[PDB]
Amino acid sequence: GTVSRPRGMRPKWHKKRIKRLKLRRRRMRQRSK
Amino acid sequence: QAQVGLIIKVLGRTGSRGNVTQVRVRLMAEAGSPDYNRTIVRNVKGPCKENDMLSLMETEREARRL
Amino acid sequence: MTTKRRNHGRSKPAHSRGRVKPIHCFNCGRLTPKDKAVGRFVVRRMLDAASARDVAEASPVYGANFPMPRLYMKQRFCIACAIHSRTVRARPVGNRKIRYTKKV
Amino acid sequence: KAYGPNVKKGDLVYGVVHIFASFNDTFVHVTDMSGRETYVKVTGGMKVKADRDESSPYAAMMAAQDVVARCKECGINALHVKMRAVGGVRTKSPGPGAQAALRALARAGMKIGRIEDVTPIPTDSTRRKGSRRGRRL
């Protein structure tokens, strides 16, 4: 342990989830415009 | 086939559970022999004491200090 | 959290340098900055006292006058490796600032 | 058996013993002073049956005693010592059998000459095995 309580998953892996989600939404709007 | 050695110093109880005693044993050999007054460190199982005697069989392996 | 060491556990003051190239740990090979790694220079005898006296008897070169060669090697450890091998141990908060400048 | 150099009885005929003691095995290799010709090579794994014990001091002592037997048939009665660890980018600490093998050669009756440490020491190196986080055991 080196950081304080996160209250959630590891923030780096939370960032990866958001990045993956942002990519998926970006492609979905590509096939509708 | 078995060389007799004499315990001259008790070093302590070694290993877990303290069932093994490490001692320094002087090999009792006749004068002029290569093993005369040769002291080696061995591990002993059972109640032992200074001035006790051991039948060493082989006398080449030396126990690791602890 | 709270700052444990003014040193931050290395020897890199705030305005001395930016990057110190890492080294591989002696035991596990973890990459750690050279100023941060625990460094010990050890001089080791090739054989113990019992073994040295046996080899000296059969050696026409080695004896009471000619010493037998030693092992010279600088060992740098990762922090975890240095704690596990007991070359370094956790200390009370007061004693943490004690520094040694020579082998003792 | 003879098979030895034409020298006076008791004269010292020198070989070179290369003792490679890693943490998995011990090598007791006897060559000449050029290293090109090998009189005998016995390893600890040649003396035990369990993989975990090929580096043990007792296996190294047993292998060293086998070497002295063959050396006597060659005519070699004295040995220069060249001991090494793994070296390179790996560990430079000698293995457990390094001390046992040398002591066994001395007790077996072979004269010991010069002793040197010849582990490969790089003046700079390629990347060591493992990640930047090291071996996580």
Next chain:
Amino acid sequence: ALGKNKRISKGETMARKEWYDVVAPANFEKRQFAKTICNKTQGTRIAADVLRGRVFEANLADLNQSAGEEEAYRKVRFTVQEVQGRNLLTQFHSMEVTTDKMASLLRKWCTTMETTVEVKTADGYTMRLFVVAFTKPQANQQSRNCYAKQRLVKWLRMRITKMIKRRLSKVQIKEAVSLLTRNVLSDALVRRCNPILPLRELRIRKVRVVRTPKFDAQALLSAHGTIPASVEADQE
């Protein structure tokens, strides 16, 4: 381990061997050092063909019986140039300080200065020399370190390069070997370099021959003087 091999084929050695004597050049006290075994000539494989070019390593203290305590930390290598009966006539190959002595000269608050000099001898030998020097504190010095200025380090390196090049380029390989074995070159180097920088120790760590001239039988003979006889071929 014993009895563990599964795939073996994937599908008296001494009897053949004959003993030989290794002979160092005449500038060494113990000429007939070492003793080796080679396969007896059989078929088209002549023994002298594979014997030429072998490099033998010996301690300097064993070659020269001079108990100066410095020769015991030097190894000398020789290359077999010609096979003459049962004698291996050698030529100097390299000289190197032992690993234990070299590693013991390092200190943690001084400058380690290294110099590489390549020199061509008079008889067409190219030698690469490696010189290591260490700074020392003065007698009354109280400073925590004796690190040297880079200007003086480069000056020391240049003076070492000039002295070694000037001294060794006008001599033969036999004389150059003597200059290196008896530490005459090292004594003059540390004498002329100490005024530049106070030196704890100046030592020629390694000497290696990198280029040899074409073989000359008469040159090899003149470097060996009176070759001692070998009794290996003689009946026991």
Next chain:
RNA sequence: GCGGGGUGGAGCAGCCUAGCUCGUCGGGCUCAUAACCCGAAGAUCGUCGGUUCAAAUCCGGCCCCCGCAACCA
């Protein structure tokens, strides 16, 4: 129309005279559950017949399921 398969509670061997694994049960280990340790039980061989001294096995018929065919106009 041709070929092939049904076997303990489940999934599959043996198919040329009963097995494994998972599951279940009892006891241990643990504060307790799991994992682990020691034992035990559970099998009309899909039904109807036949051959044979003896048929899960060999020869027919029957019920499900499974595939491959079902073309030229």
Next chain:
RNA sequence: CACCAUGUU
């Protein structure tokens, strides 16, 4: 430096 998962509000 074998293997040690979990505990209703």
Next chain:
RNA sequence: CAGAGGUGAAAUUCUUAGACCGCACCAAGACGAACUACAGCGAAGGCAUUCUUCAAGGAUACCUUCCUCAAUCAAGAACCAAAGUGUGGAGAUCGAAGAUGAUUAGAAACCAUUGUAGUCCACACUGCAAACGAUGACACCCAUGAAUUGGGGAUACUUAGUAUCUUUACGGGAAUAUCCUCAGCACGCACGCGAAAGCUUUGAGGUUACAGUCUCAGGGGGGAGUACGUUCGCAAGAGUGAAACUUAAAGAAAUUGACGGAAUGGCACCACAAGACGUGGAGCGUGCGGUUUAAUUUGACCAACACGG
């Protein structure tokens, strides 16, 4: 000549078609050990073999020059570890992905053997890092002791010391000793400050006794650095950046306990070791639970169960 490798132990793997090991070599690509330091240089990122070279940069020295030319900043511009992208090279080592072997209840994780992209170079992109001193820049004041790097100087008082070593050519030299000085990275440590941890001429001091100058950012926790729009980018992404809604705390530093497959020192046959005699298997007595019964009265689950005498 019969194994080698590898691990906690193994196996995948290599090996009489000669592995491993031994000696001297050859090729290729990386890297520059020890010396290496609370050391130096750089705006930061970063920078460690030698020699030859090309432009710079800082400090110091000066009774040289000059004469407010400065400080800090939207916009704008350049640089920027690693990973990643494009095109050529290179491809030893290590090694995302993948493969195989283990371990496991499972393990496509940690461990083992490998291996692609990468890792290296040139050119062109990308502009993100715990890019950290988690501490913006310039300036002023500020107590003490021991050091260190570079350059110089000396050998309520009218002036207050001193050496050592080497020394035929980068040499009227070099390094040292004492004292002083300017600049730089810092250490142990006086005011004062702070929620505290701590900071302290290196401020986080000189602030409710609140004003030297400029600039950037923040306003409970989430939603969210998300959505939308827009600019930039080959892409990966980057910059800018909400709301609906949700929630009483989130958070900071310390204190005392408790706990740790953290460490130190001790201790115990309700622990082990060395052992003994059993218990667990059989019959039976008894207690407890189930089942049964009109009811089988009930408490108790190491510290309940020949216990409530």
